[PDB]
Every structure is written in structure tokens, then in C-alpha cells.
């Protein structure tokens, strides 16, 4: 049995790609790459595609549970938010790919116990002005869930205690009267 069965995942996942081509629609630009629901199918996809560090600036990968669009206004994201990891240009080289793989593994591996159900997806943004990785969750007001996810994710990335990462609500980000978005939680 272990000699021939694929190892199912708790959830079915969809990998998306976005190219920020300003001369086309954000509908023609967003793109389902593929869906998978086993560990082996995850690896076959990951091995076939570019590392984030090799994408052109302005591109995203997004891994979301099947049925959740990688867009904050989706029913399952609209009341939620994201644990944001910001990276500088030198971390593109040292940390981006390793942090993104670890993020994928936390999602597909259900690494947040009961609270993995609050996870919607994850996004990596490749940008000239700084790369970003984030885990999106369903409800900002689920304080225990959001906090546990943040604590485990920080530990999995190996970030030291002196580094603070913030959780920002999507609605706050969309409607901020200023430059920076305020946090709902930090870890």
C-alpha cells in the first residue's frame, strides 16, 4: 500500500500565476496553473516551475485552497487578512525561495493544527521595490487562530525574536488613509 498509493493532502490546492502586464486586463493576466491533492502531485508541479527568485518583477505565485480565488474580495478572504513577510533585494537571493517553499509546506502539510482551517492561501510577490510573502487567513477577528498561525509560521521560517512580522486586514489595506497599513496582530 505504501509502495504504490499517493499520499493525499487534507485539502485540494490551486496554484495561480499573475503577470502585472499594464497593457492587458487583470483578468487576462491572472492564471490557474494547476490543481493538486497529493504530496507527489505537489512535487511534480513545484519541480516543473520557475523558482520565485527567477520570475520577472511584477509577477506573483498564489497557492489557495480549491474554491478560493487568490483575491481579497473572495467571500473567504473579504473579512480576513495576511501575515506579511517583507524582504529586501539581498534576501531575494538568500531567503525568498526557501521561505516560499516553507510557506507552501505549512499550507499543504496543515502545520497550524485546528487553525489550519482558517488558512485560505499564500502569495509571493516578486517586485523591484521588495519581495513579499504572505499567508492569507479567513477572519481577522479569530484572534486565537490568527495568533497561532503567526507563531508557528515565524518559527518555521526561523526568524529570530528581534524580527517583528505584522498581520494586516485586507479591508484595512484597501482603505488605509496614509502610506503604511496598521497591524491587527504582530509576532
Amino acid at each position: 500500500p505504501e509502495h504504490y498509493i499517493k499520499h493525499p493532502l487534507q485539502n485540494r490546492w490551486a496554484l495561480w500565476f499573475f503577470k502585472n502586464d499594464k497593457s492587458k486586463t487583470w483578468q487576462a493576466n491572472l492564471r490557474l496553473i494547476s490543481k493538486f491533492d497529493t504530496v507527489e502531485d505537489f512535487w511534480a508541479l513545484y519541480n516543473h516551475i520557475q523558482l520565485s527568485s527567477n520570475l520577472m518583477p511584477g509577477c506573483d505565485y498564489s497557492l489557495f485552497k480549491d474554491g478560493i480565488e487568490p483575491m481579497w474580495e473572495d467571500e473567504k478572504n473579504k473579512r480576513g487578512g495576511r501575515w506579511l513577510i517583507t524582504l529586501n533585494k539581498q534576501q531575494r537571493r538568500s531567503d525568498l525561495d526557501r521561505f516560499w517553499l516553507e510557506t507552501l509546506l505549512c499550507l499543504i502539510g496543515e502545520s497550524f493544527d485546528d487553525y489550519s482551517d482558517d488558512v485560505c492561501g499564500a502569495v509571493v510577490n516578486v517586485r523591484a521595490k521588495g519581495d513579499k510573502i504572505a499567508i492569507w487567513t479567513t477572519e481577522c477577528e479569530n484572534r486565537e487562530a490568527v495568533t497561532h498561525i503567526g507563531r508557528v509560521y515565524k518559527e518555521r521560517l526561523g526568524l529570530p525574536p528581534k524580527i517583528v512580522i505584522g498581520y494586516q486586514s485586507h479591508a484595512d489595506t484597501a482603505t488605509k488613509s496614509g502610506s503604511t497599513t496598521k497591524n491587527r496582530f504582530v509576532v
Binding site: 499520499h7 487534507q10 504530496v39 502539510g109
Partner: peptide, 14 residues
Amino acid sequence: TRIIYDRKFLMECR
């Protein structure tokens, strides 16, 4: 229950 895979296992399937 729930299907949980730790990091070591998920790496051994690659």
C-alpha cells in the same frame, strides 16, 4: 482526524 505532514516527511517524498 486531520491529515498532517511534518516538514521532514514532505521533503522525503521529493
